[PDB]
């Protein structure tokens, strides 16, 4: 359960799991997450920007 | 008398019999009422 450095995971096929719902950005108590998204070239719902300010994060 | 079934003419109805009878009936009808316009989209 230990929480360390953040990571973005993907599916076994190699496609990223993130679908740019912005729930993590919404809940972040420190406003440490910045997200920008757009439809991908194949129409998928994916992020174009996903930044975490680690000096604002409270982990 | 009773033993005879008397509904066999429905055995000789075609595809168009209903609409043919409607066409025959058309001349017996009273003139239809009118709402005042051609259609609700008019």
């Amino acid at each position: 359960r230990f929480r360390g450095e953040h990571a973005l995971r993907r599916y076994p096929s190699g496609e990223e799991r993130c679908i740019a719902c912005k729930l993590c950005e919404a809940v972040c108590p420190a406003q440490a997450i910045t997200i920008e998204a757009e439809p991908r070239a194949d129409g998928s719902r994916r992020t174009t920007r996903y930044d975490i300010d680690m000096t604002k994060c409270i982990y | 008398d009773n033993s005879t079934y008397r509904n066999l003419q429905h055995h000789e109805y075609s595809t168009y019999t209903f609409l043919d009878l409607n066409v025959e009936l058309s001349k017996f009808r009273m003139p239809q009422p009118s709402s005042g316009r051609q259609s609700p989209r008019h």
Partner: protein
């Protein structure tokens, strides 16, 4: 004059003849839940989310369509009306897809908010859901019809406001679907408004897709200049 007296939760209110239960509740400040009723559209009465109890009446009535009668005491928060709301919300959510993270109407969903405020907090639906194929109606309105709740707001708006009768329903029962039945674009100068009236993410803005969430946006109240209507 011709005003009649009715009661909302025992509070007297004078209304014009022909006023429905929903507007009588509106006059006191209570907003009845709704999915198919719109002020600017014709009354439909199919979503049954506006069911409310009349005192000394065994059957709940549809507030959006039922004219109020003199001396009626509308019980907006009685147990019967709350149970009716919960049942209707359960039925609406039984086949709804679990698309909230990927649905553009996430934080702006009347289905979500009315489920949180008037529905239950869990499901007892142990079956499989239905899925329908999407329709193409042009490059402005993105269509995902699995999210459709069949409120028929889009059909009524297209027929009555836009003057375009290309939208409708096909099939019967659970597989009745809202669309055109032929490949055809719903293209009119007022076509985008069906995005606003649709309570769910079935109809969304295509150029706006996936770009922002409602809680992020800052709202500036302004005026259009694309024509002289203002």
């Amino acid at each position: 004059s011709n005003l009649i007296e009715v009661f909302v939760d025992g509070q007297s209110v004078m209304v014009e003849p022909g006023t429905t239960v929903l507007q009588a509740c509106e006059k006191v400040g209570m907003q009845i839940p709704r999915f198919c009723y719109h002020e600017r559209l014709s009354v439909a009465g199919n979503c049954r989310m506006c069911l409310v109890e009349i005192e000394k009446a065994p059957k709940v009535v549809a507030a959006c369509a039922m004219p109020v009668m003199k001396g009626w005491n509308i019980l907006t928060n009685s147990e019967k009306s709350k149970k009716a709301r919960e049942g209707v919300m359960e039925f609406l959510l039984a086949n709804h897809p679990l698309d909230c993270p990927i649905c553009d109407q996430g934080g702006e969903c009347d289905l979500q908010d009315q489920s949180m405020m008037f529905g239950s907090d869990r499901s007892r639906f142990l079956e499989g859901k239905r899925a329908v194929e999407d329709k193409n109606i042009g490059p402005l309105v993105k269509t995902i019809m699995t999210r459709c709740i069949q409120c028929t707001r889009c059909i009524r708006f297209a027929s009555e406001i836009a003057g375009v009768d290309d939208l409708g329903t096909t099939g019967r029962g659970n597989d009745m679907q809202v669309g055109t039945y032929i490949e055809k674009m719903f293209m009119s100068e007022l076509s985008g408004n069906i995005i606003d009236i649709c309570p769910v993410g079935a109809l969304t803005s295509k150029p706006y897709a996936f770009t922002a969430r409602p809680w992020e946006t800052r709202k500036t109240e302004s005026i259009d200049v694309m024509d002289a209507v203002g």
